[PDB]
Amino acid sequence: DDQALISEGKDLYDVACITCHGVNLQGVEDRGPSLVGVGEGAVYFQVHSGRMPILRNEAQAERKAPRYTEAQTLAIAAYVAANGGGPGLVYNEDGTLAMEELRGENYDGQITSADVARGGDLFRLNCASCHNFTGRGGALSSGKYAPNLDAANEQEIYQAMLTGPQNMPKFSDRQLSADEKKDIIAFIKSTKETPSPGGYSLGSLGPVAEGLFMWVFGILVLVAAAMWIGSRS
Amino acid sequence: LWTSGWTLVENDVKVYLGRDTAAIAESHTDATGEHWSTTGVSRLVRMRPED
Amino acid sequence: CSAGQITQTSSQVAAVDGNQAGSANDPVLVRDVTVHLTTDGEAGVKFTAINQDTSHTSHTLESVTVDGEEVELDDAEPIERNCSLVADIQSELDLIEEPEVGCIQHVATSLENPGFAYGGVVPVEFVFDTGAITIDATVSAPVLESGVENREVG
Amino acid sequence: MKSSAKLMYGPTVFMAAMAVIYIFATMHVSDGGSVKGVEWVGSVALVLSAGLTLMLGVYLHFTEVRVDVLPEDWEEAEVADKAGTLGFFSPSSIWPAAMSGAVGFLAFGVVYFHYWMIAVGLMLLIFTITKLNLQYGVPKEKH
Amino acid sequence: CEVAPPGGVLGDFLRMGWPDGITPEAVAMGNFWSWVWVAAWIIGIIMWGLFLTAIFAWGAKRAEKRGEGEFPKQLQYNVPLELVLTIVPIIIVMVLFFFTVQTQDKVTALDKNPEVTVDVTAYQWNWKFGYSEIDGSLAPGGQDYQGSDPERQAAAEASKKDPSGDNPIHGNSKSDVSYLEFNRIETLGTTDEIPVMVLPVNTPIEFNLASADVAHSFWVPEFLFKRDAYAHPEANKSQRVFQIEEITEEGAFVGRCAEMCGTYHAMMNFELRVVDRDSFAEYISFRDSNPDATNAQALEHIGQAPYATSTSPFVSDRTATRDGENTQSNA
Numbered sequence: 001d002d003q004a005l006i007s008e009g010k011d012l013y014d015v016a017c018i019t020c021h022g023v024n025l026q027g028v029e030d031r032g033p034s035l036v037g038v039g040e041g042a043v044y045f046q047v048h049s050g051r052m053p054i055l056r057n058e059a060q061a062e063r064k065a066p067r068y069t070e071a072q073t074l075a076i077a078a079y080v081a082a083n084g085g086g087p088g089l090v091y092n093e094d095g096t097l098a099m100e101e102l103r104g105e106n107y108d109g110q111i112t113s114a115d116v117a118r119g120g121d122l123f124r125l126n127c128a129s130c131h132n133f134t135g136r137g138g139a140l141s142s143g144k145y146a147p148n149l150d151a152a153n154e155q156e157i158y159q160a161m162l163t164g165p166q167n168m169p170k171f172s173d174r175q176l177s178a179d180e181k182k183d184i185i186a187f188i189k190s191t192k193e194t195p196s197p198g199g200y201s202l203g204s205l206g207p208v209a210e211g212l213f214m215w216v217f218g219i220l221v222l223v224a225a226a227m228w229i230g231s232r233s
Numbered sequence: 234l235w236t237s238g239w240t241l242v243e244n245d246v247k248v249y250l251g252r253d254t255a256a257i258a259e260s261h262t263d264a265t266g267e268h269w270s271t272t273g274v275s276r277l278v279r280m281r282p283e284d
Numbered sequence: 285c286s287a288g289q290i291t292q293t294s295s296q297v298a299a300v301d302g303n304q305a306g307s308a309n310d311p312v313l314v315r316d317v318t319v320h321l322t323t324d325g326e327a328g329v330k331f332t333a334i335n336q337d338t339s340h341t342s343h344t345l346e347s348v349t350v351d352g353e354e355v356e357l358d359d360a361e362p363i364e365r366n367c368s369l370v371a372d373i374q375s376e377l378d379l380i381e382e383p384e385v386g387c388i389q390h391v392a393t394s395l396e397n398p399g400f401a402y403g404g405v406v407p408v409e410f411v412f413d414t415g416a417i418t419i420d421a422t423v424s425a426p427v428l429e430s431g432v433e434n435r436e437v438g
Numbered sequence: 439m440k441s442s443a444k445l446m447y448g449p450t451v452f453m454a455a456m457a458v459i460y461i462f463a464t465m466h467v468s469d470g471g472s473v474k475g476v477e478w479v480g481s482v483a484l485v486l487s488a489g490l491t492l493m494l495g496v497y498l499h500f501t502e503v504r505v506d507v508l509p510e511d512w513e514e515a516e517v518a519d520k521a522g523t524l525g526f527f528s529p530s531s532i533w534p535a536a537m538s539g540a541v542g543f544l545a546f547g548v549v550y551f552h553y554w555m556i557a558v559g560l561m562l563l564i565f566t567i568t569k570l571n572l573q574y575g576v577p578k579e580k581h
Numbered sequence: 582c583e584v585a586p587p588g589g590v591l592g593d594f595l596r597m598g599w600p601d602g603i604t605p606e607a608v609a610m611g612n613f614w615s616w617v618w619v620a621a622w623i624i625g626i627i628m629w630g631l632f633l634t635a636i637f638a639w640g641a642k643r644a645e646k647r648g649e650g651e652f653p654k655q656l657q658y659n660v661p662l663e664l665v666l667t668i669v670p671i672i673i674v675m676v677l678f679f680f681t682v683q684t685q686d687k688v689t690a691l692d693k694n695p696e697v698t699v700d701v702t703a704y705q706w707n708w709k710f711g712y713s714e715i716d717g718s719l720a721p722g723g724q725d726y727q728g729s730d731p732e733r734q735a736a737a738e739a740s741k742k743d744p745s746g747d748n749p750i751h752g753n754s755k756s757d758v759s760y761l762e763f764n765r766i767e768t769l770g771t772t773d774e775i776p777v778m779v780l781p782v783n784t785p786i787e788f789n790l791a792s793a794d795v796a797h798s799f800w801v802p803e804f805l806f807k808r809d810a811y812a813h814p815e816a817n818k819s820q821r822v823f824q825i826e827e828i829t830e831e832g833a834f835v836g837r838c839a840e841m842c843g844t845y846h847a848m849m850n851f852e853l854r855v856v857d858r859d860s861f862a863e864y865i866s867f868r869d870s871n872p873d874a875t876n877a878q879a880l881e882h883i884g885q886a887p888y889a890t891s892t893s894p895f896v897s898d899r900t901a902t903r904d905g906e907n908t909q910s911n912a
């Protein structure tokens with residue numbers, strides 16, 4: 001099954017990626033890195049989230065609407081895997097890519113809150129420095145930034161942790177084991193998918209959003225009330 | 234301000250580089266009631282150079 | 285300002301342990317050269333030798349060595365232009381499929397461990413019929429089957 | 439407003455004739471170096487361009503049959519004919535600049551697509567437009 | 582046109598920098614261009630003369646020295662002359678449009694009976710050529726060669742729908758590539774090598790354009806012709822096929838992209854190499870017999886340059902190119 005999939009992988013690779021990665025994935029001098037040994041997971045992350053192709057050299061690549069569908073993504077990943085392998089996709093017990101089954105070490109049918117606690121402390125330890133407390137993203141040096149984690153599915157999160165896309169450090173499966181990674185996924189999805197008890201969240205950016213809101217519009221409405229109650233002379 | 238934990242390595246103690254496992258305390262419940270235990274867990278853990 | 289001639293996205297290399305040698309102008313390139321040493325003690329040299337000699341002077345990997353010590357490898361076909369000889373330890377080599385379309389060939393490797401340390405770096409010396417290529421490579425364990433392993437306390 | 443009401447009939451009829459000619463042409467001529475078949479972009483544009491000019495012309499004519507022999511159109515009018523009030527004109531107003539800034543804020547909001555910027559931009563925009571339209575009718579200060 | 586330009590230095594001036602051209606319709610376009618330039622020069626000089634007359638003849642100081650007074654004749658309307666001068670450009674553009682229709686129609690007509698048809702794919706940022714069909718005269722087998730690859734094109738037709746189901750664009754997947762033709766004899770352009778399509782002399786040839794990515798254009802300056810390559814040309818109602826009656830002389834000719842496609846738009850060159858008709862049979866039999874061999878090896882088999890002599894690949898480093906040596910040494 002994979003042997004014929006690799007052919008479509010090659011056909012798609014020849015028509016898009018050579019200009020940056022070479023016919024033999026060796027890379028190009030300043031135009032793109034070598035893809036030997038990156039594996040299925042890096043290709044899946046890069047193509048499925050739509051980061052590749054990169055049509056402009058920049059401080060950082062951008063997520064966008066993907067140029068290929070799922071089957072084409074797996075075909076290109078199979079072709080790249082044939083050149084040296086690498087980290088692999090997390091296949092579930094039936095053979096499909098794992099989605100919604102990575103939400104915690106002890107997932108049954110709903111997010112276990114103990115996993116959420118451990119994953120919250122893990123995310124605060126490692127991930128929250130570049131992203132923020134709830135994964136709303138953050139800034140870096142010279143025009144680079146850490147994206148907001150609301151866009152990615154669970155497989156993309158796992159392969160992001162595994163591969164270290166551009167400036168993200170790698171988190172191998174022996175630094176952060178599968179239980180730790182799945183608890184991190186559980187915490188990310190819990191924070192994403194739970195409404196704030198205290199009303200509208202103001203984006204959860206912290207003091208900046210709350211400040212801007214009050215110190216512009218909250219005081220503006222009260223001076224409007226004062227003008228209603230007072231006089232202009 | 235001249236000292237830290239690593240000062241214990243001043244020819245006194247063997248000090249490993251401990252990684253944080255972020256482990257919570259674990260609950261245990263029976264007829265006596267639910268109580269939390271840290272007797273079987275460890276937050277800091279040693280690490281080999283291939284991790 | 286970030287789209288200038290010096291750009292952050294352009295200078296990047298792959299997020300892999302393997303070093304690499306050769307420019308776009310060089311005849312034969314080695315990509316992803318690494319010394320693998322599984323936890324069970326077996327070891328070898330992962331790499332990929334790509335031929336891009338515009339003279340079409342097809343080569344044959346005569347030998348590879350790590351710190352002068354031999355590494356076993358056999359059945360290496362000549363590499364004509366735009367072809368890749370992928371080499372890895374047999375256990376890891378079994379995980380990926382040989383492509384029936386394309387020029388790639390898979391070859392297995394193994395070396396006796398003289399006592400290399402995880403984390404360190406050791407020279408690797410390739411010699412092909414047309415010349416020798418030297419490159420320092422790190423020592424590390426192979427990648428786990430992703431998702432199967434848990435942090436175990438004891 | 440007689441001459442300008444009626445001079446608009448040339449452009450509109452020319453555009454309408456070009457629209458029908460073009461629709462028949464592209465739907466029938468199977469010339470090499472091109473593909474047969476009616477194209478809707480262009481034809482729709484031509485018919486609604488004829489529509490714009492026809493709307494202008496017909497409204498102007500429908501109005502002009504009402505108006506009298508204005509002195510500006512009388513070929514031998516005297517300067518004393520138009521003596522009187524010409525009309526009311528705004529002396530000054532800060533609100534055009536304000537609502538330009540409001541539209542700018544809204545446009546920047548849709549650039550980055552921060553939803554709060556879009557909402558605040560629309561609110562600020564209708565506020566500035568309202569302040570523009572009520573400028574010369576705000577009540578006197580109620581004691 | 583059927584009538585040749587004046588020739589000589591006058592023709593060179595009227596050319597005015599056009600390539601001579603290597604096809605019949607290239608000659609036609611060049612002749613039409615030369616005579617149109619003659620008429621344009623007539624108009625240009627015969628109105629620059631009137632402006633110069635205003636500068637030197639109709640000056641105010643001259644007429645005041647002559648005693649003409651403070652003002653001229655104050656003429657406003659000369660209706661018959663105005664109508665004549667209105668009728669003149671009408672006839673000029675009319676008679677011009679007649680020959681325009683003539684030359685245009687003999688250029689664009691798709692009835693030239695190709696012996697060779699080459700499918701061309703444009704992508705960001707290089708060219709991929711594939712021989713689609715070859716007449717039995719030039720084909721290896723005696724019978725007509727058909728180059729469509731069954732398995733790889735079957736993958737293309739299977740890409741149309743159902744990647745577990747998204748199908749947004751009129752019931753097809755947004756990443757459809759069924760419009761691309763995949764052939765078994767292909768030349769693939771790279772940043773390390775300028776692709777070279779090999780064509781024979783004196784045969785009607787056909788080009789079938791398409792684009793994997795954003796819109797490109799195929800421009801051979803020696804054809805004096807260029808055509809846009811689009812993704813889904815049928816969906817765009819764009820004519821993706823164009824035919825040349827023949828090429829009339831051998832040689833290597835650069836061809837460029839003439840449509841703004843992206844960052845590396847300038848780096849997207851190719852070469853069109855026209856070879857003796859007897860050598861083309863050797864080339865195609867060589868490529869068919871041992872497909873693993875590269876394009877350069879086939880060109881060596883002919884006995885000509887393995888790489889594009891017209892243009893060398895650009896240097897791919899963004900710092901080394903500062904000193905003007907932006908050319909890669911192919912060998």
Ligand code: HEC
Pocket residue numbers: 049051060061062063123126127128129130131145146147148149150151152156157158160161165166167168169171184
């Ligand atoms: C700063 C050094 C980072 C740390 C620490 C972590 N990540 Fe990160 N991450 C970072 C960058 C610069 C990027 C963008 C990469 C790119 O090529 O665009 C990312 C991206 C992700 C993503 C993808 C988000 C998306 O929208 O596709 C995910 C899911 C992600 N990162 C997760 C993640 C986790 C779970 C981390 C802690 C283990 C973590 N990252 C660390 C920078 C940094």
Ligand code: HEC
Pocket residue numbers: 012013016017018019020021031032033035038042043046047051052053054055061076080163164165166293294296297298299300705
């Ligand atoms: C240039 C025109 C590109 C094309 C076409 C494609 N990619 Fe690319 N890729 C490009 C750059 C400049 C970079 C480095 C910047 C970055 O975002 O990392 C990359 C990187 C990758 C990677 C990451 C490798 C890693 O070690 O993590 C992968 C996996 C990758 N590219 C794959 C890929 C594939 C499969 C493409 C065609 C389907 C493809 N890229 C297009 C530039 C360009």
